[PDB]
Amino acid sequence: NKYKRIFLVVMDSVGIGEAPDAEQFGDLGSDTIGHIAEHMNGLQMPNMVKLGLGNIREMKGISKVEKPLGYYTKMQEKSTGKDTMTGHWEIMGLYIDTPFQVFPEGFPKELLDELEEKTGRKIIGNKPASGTEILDELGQEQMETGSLIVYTSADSVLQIAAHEEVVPLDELYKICKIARELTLDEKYMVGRVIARPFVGEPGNFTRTPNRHDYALKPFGRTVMNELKDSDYDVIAIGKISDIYDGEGVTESLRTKSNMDGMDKLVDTLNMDFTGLSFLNLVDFDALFGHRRDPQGYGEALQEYDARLPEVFAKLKEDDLLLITADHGNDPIHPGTDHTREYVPLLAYSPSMKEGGQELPLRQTFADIGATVAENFGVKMPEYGTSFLNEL
Numbered sequence: 384n385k386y387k388r389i390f391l392v393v394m395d396s397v398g399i400g401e402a403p404d405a406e407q408f409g410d411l412g413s414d415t416i417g418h419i420a421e422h423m424n425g426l427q428m429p430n431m432v433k434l435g436l437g438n439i440r441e442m443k444g445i446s447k448v449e450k451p452l453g454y455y456t457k458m459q460e461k462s463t464g465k466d467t468m469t470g471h472w473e474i475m476g477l478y479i480d481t482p483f484q485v486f487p488e489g490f491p492k493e494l495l496d497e498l499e500e501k502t503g504r505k506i507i508g509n510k511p512a513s514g515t516e517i518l519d520e521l522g523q524e525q526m527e528t529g530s531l532i533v534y535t536s537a538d539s540v541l542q543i544a545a546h547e548e549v550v551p552l553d554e555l556y557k558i559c560k561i562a563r564e565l566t567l568d569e570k571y572m573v574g575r576v577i578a579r580p581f582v583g584e585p586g587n588f589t590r591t592p593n594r595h596d597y598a599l600k601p602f603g604r605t606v607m608n609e610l611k612d613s614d615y616d617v618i619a620i621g622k623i624s625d626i627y628d629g630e631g632v633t634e635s636l637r638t639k640s641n642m643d644g645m646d647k648l649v650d651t652l653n654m655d656f657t658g659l660s661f662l663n664l665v666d667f668d669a670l671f672g673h674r675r676d677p678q679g680y681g682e683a684l685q686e687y688d689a690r691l692p693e694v695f696a697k698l699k700e701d702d703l704l705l706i707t708a709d710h711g712n713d714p715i716h717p718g719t720d721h722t723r724e725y726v727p728l729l730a731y732s733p734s735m736k737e738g739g740q741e742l743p744l745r746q747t748f749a750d751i752g753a754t755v756a757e758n759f760g761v762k763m764p765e766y767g768t769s770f771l772n773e774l
């Protein structure tokens with residue numbers, strides 16, 4: 384193998400400017416990093432700059448360098464959707480025609496009617512809402528009537544809340560499985576179904592650790608599957624295992640924050656493994672992008688950047704670090720949905736003694752998967768062109 388270990392970091396939603404097909408998605412003008420940098424009056428990301436972020440695109444506080452540490456370019460998304468699952472499935476070698484849907488006006492009557500018909504239970508709510516706010520609003524009615532609180536967020540989710548003393552846990556799980564079946568439909572294609580059991584009384588409801596998430600398998604066997612099948616390590620950090628529904632994963636490390644994600648990355652650097660360590664830094668998307676908070680987003684980017692020199696120090700000669708994103712989520716953009724953007728790509732190994740150069744623009748995110756597959760000598764994905772030989 385060229386590299387013994389590859390560390391792949393997805394900065395979730397960290398887009399680098401509107402894609403050629405942005406107009407189709409209502410995303411003209413979008414620019415996640417660029418708009419953040421303007422808000423911050425210059426983003427302080429000196430380590431990403433050293434890697435070559437400014438060499439991809441110059442932005443406020445982010446300038447090109449004469450000798451970037453590694454190779455750099457951006458990637459264009461080929462799949463139809465601009466969600467997390469689509470972006471990640473494409474990164475690992477797939478092409479996804481069917482987009483996962485978001486529901487700012489709630490779910491279609493047709494879907495909810497069938498859910499009622501299959502379960503024998505009434506549905507209340509049916510709107511985007513905070514999971515804690517909707518319990519204060521509707522939790523008492525739920526307890527009194529045995530109905531189901533169905534709600535959504537800014538992402539592709541269908542969430543079902545029910546009190547554990549009124550609707551038995553095992554019944555809530557059965558209901559969610561029915562919903563998971565019904566939502567495998569492009570009339571109303573939902574990324575995740577989530578059980579949200581709660582306890583307590585009006586004015587004091589608590590959501591329990593009995594939450595369960597019902598994910599879809601990726602629409603194809605991924606490069607992760609092939610790595611696992613060839614007895615390589617595939618270490619998933621953060622939301623990675625959930626995003627792939629565990630497919631191809633050999634170890635999973637839960638994280639509570641971006642800083643905790645970087646700590647687990649450091650943990651994997653300290654492990655003797657051969658294969659892939661795959662981190663998702665989700666805070667950018669979950670806390671700041673959807674909430675349209677450019678200040679919080681900018682601060683989070685600066686906090687992430689400050690962690691990188693320790694990562695640089697621990698990389699071995701036969702390690703490769705890949706940093707990218709899975710879509711955009713411009714915090715100064717109308718609405719609450721993601722944005723269709725190019726994503727940055729930085730590729731760095733300490734073995735790059737003369738620094739890096741510009742790579743040709745990656746025409747699919749699957750180029751990452753192809754590179755990983757070629758490195759480890761496993762079956763090449765159907766889509767994607769490796770850049771391994773360019774490094």
Ligand SMILES: O=P(O)(O)OC[C@H]1O[C@H](O)[C@H](O)[C@@H]1O
Pocket residue numbers: 512513514515536537538540542579
């Ligand atoms: O805490 P809630 O408001 O119920 O749910 C918000 C998000 O919590 C989970 O990460 C899902 O991504 C949801 O979109």
Ligand SMILES: [Mn+2]
Pocket residue numbers: 408409410411716717718720721722
């Ligand atoms: Mn838009």
Ligand SMILES: [Mn+2]
Pocket residue numbers: 395396466467468470668709710
């Ligand atoms: Mn994402």
Ligand SMILES: [Mn+2]
Pocket residue numbers: 467538668669673712721
């Ligand atoms: Mn999102």
